[PDB]
């Protein structure tokens, strides 16, 4: 069943709808919510319930036609249907899509010097300062290899990143910018716009007064990136559910009529406000923010953003803004290169183990001397 698209509906009118019929190789190529162009013919279909045949009988403010032998003393009526012969939207895949130009570009990128900074500049050209944040958020896109232990338990792949800052400054820009760049990503907030919110919920379906699930933001963001704004202010119901979703990458439900396990495999980038709006530069992050220790311990990286009214900096920011309004690598190069890079699965070397265990031991004894 299809409906008039938002562009066609004449003002004040109710939408019209039509029944479309698909056959053979075209079947199950369109899902509810999709917008597509169909090619075919308009046809007329009779009321089959009032015809009679040697094989099967008839079943039984307008009138139909009369006077056919097969119709007896009943009357026959028609309706309109559209028979569509075609429908279209309105590892090997990389080898198929990349021409020699794309291969040369990813090779040049692989051989590039200070590629890290070049990609930071290319992906975040509008941003000023704050290189550490740019390096951190850039690494999140490359993820980490997931592993399954022999007894069947599994080890987490995605990293999670958190940014805290004053409402006047940069933290919102990163979220909306990476969301505009990235494929298959979701933007939302702790003050969510639906009954489901950040994780699945149960609703009663009035077609049977039967209980069914409804997806939250972290279910839809499966196999993608999730951006959450104003994370310091969030519902308790979701906050408990997030404990499992952050590490186990799954959601579990057990209520009347519904019992299920749902996937939530996602990289989260969270943005939050400190208490009293401006960050107290004299105090730790843990004193400044609203989050509890169990949630806070989940993230792999943390960053702080806070303003001060330096005249030259303000003047430079203003000139940048007005100049932008007055007007190395493209985003598609970054996309193609990122999809190329994510096929590698590097191992750790034997010698790297000694450095890793040493650094962790150094960190642990430092913590013990003045938790990790």
Q: Report, in Å, the least distance between residue 59 CB and DNA.
A: 8
User: Rounded to an integer, what distance in angstroms lies between the CA atom of residue 265 and that of residue 256?
Assistant: 26
Is 101 annotated as belonging to a binding site? no
Cβ–Cβ under 8 Å, residues 210 and 170: no
Q: CB within 8 A of 265, min separation 6: which ones?
A: 158, 222, 223, 249
Q: Which of 68, 71, 45 is nearest to 59 (CA)?
A: 71
| Contact between 69 and another protein per CB under 8 A | yes
Give Cα 268 distance to the centre of its chain: 10
Nearer to DNA by Cβ, of 195 and 328: the residue is 195
Q: What are the tokens at 265?
A: 């495999």
Q: Which 218-277 positions form the footprint of DNA (CB under 7 A)?
A: 255-256
User: Please, how many CA atoms are within 13 Å of residue 280, restricted to the half-sphere of its CB?
Assistant: 10
Q: Name the DSSP class of 76.
A: B
Q: Given candidates 202, 285, 301, 339, which one binds DNA under the rule CB under 7 A?
A: 202
Is 128 annotated as belonging to a binding site? yes
Q: Given candidates 94, 139, 192, 295, which one binds another protein under the rule CB under 8 A?
A: 192
Q: What are the tokens at 294?
A: 């169990």
Q: Which of 87, 77, 75, 69 is nearest to 30 (CA)?
A: 87
User: Residue written as tokens 């803004």?
Assistant: 321
Residue 54: which of DNA, another protein, none does it interact with, CB under 5 to 8 A by kind?
DNA
Q: Which 119-148 positions form the footprint of another protein (CB under 8 A)?
A: none
Q: Given candidates 1, 57, 95, 259, which one binds another protein under the rule CB under 8 A?
A: 1
- Choose one: 49-57, 147-155, 169-177, 361-369; the region binding DNA (CB under 7 A): 49-57
Q: Which of 276, 269, 280 is nearest to 302 (CA)?
A: 269
User: Rounded to an integer, what distance in angstroms lies between the CA atom of residue 176 and that of residue 172?
Assistant: 6
DSSP-derived secondary structure for 208-234: TTEEEEE--HHHHTTTEEEEEESTTS-
Nearer to another protein by Cβ, of 74 and 156: the residue is 74
Residue 36: which of DNA, another protein, none does it interact with, CB under 5 to 8 A by kind?
none
Is 362 annotated as belonging to a binding site? no
Is 168 annotated as belonging to a binding site? yes
Q: Which 318-347 positions form the footprint of another protein (CB under 8 A)?
A: 318-319, 321-322, 325-326
Nearer to DNA by Cβ, of 17 and 250: the residue is 250
User: Dihedral of the CA atoms 69, 75, 77, 83 (nearest 10)?
Assistant: -20
Nearer to DNA by Cβ, of 258 and 341: the residue is 258
Phi then psi dihedrals of residue 10, to 5 deg? -70, 145
Nearer to DNA by Cβ, of 26 and 192: the residue is 192
Binding site for another protein (CB under 8 A): 1, 3, 6, 11-17, 31-33, 43-44, 46, 50, 60-63, 65-69, 73-74, 78-80, 166-169, 187, 189, 191-196, 214-215, 220, 230, 275-278, 287, 290, 307, 309, 311, 314-315, 317-319, 321-322, 325-326
Q: Which residues are annotated as part of the binding site?
A: 128, 168-172, 273
Binding annotation for ATP: 128, 168-172, 273
């Amino acid at each position: 069943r299809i409906q008039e698209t938002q562009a066609e509906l004449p003002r004040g009118s109710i939408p019209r709808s039509l029944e479309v019929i698909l056959r053979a190789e075209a079947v199950e190529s369109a899902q509810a919510g999709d917008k597509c162009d169909f090619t075919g013919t308009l046809i007329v279909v009779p009321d089959v319930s009032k015809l009679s045949t040697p094989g099967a009988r008839a079943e039984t403010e307008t009138e139909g036609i009369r006077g056919l032998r097969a119709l007896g003393v009943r009357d026959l009526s028609y309706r309109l249907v559209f028979l569509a012969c075609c429908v279209a939207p309105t590892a090997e895949s990389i080898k198929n899509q990349m021409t020699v130009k794309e291969w040369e570009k990813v090779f040049e990128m692989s051989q590039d010097k200070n590629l890290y900074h070049n990609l930071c500049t290319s992906l975040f050209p509008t941003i000023h300062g704050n290189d550490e944040v740019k390096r951190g958020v850039l690494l999140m896109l490359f993820g980490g290899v997931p592993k399954t232990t022999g007894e069947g338990t599994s080890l987490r792949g995605d990293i999670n990143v958190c940014i805290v800052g004053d409402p006047s400054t940069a933290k919102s820009q990163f979220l909306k910018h990476v969301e505009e760049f990235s494929p298959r990503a979701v933007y939302t907030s702790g003050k969510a716009s639906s009954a489901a919110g950040l994780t699945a919920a149960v609703v009663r379906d009035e077609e049977s007064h039967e209980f069914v699930i409804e997806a939250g933001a972290l279910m839809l963001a499966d196999n993608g990136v999730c951006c959450i704004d104003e994370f310091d202010k969030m519902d308790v119901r979701d906050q408990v559910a997030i404990h499992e979703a952050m590490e186990q990458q799954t959601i579990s439900i057990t209520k009347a009529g519904v019992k299920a396990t749902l996937n939530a495999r996602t990289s989260i980038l969270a943005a939050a406000n400190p208490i009293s709006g401006h960050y107290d530069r004299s105090k730790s992050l843990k004193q400044n923010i609203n989050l509890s220790a169990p949630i806070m311990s989940r993230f792999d990286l943390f960053f702080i953003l806070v303003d001060e009214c330096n005249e030259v900096t303000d003047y430079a920011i203003a000139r940048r803004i007005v100049d932008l309004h007055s007007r190395v690598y493209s985003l598609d190069d970054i996309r193609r290169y990122l999809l190329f890079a994510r096929q590698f699965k590097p191992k750790i070397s034997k010698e790297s183990e000694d450095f890793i265990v040493e650094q962790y031991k150094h960190l642990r004894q430092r913590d013990g001397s003045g938790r990790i």
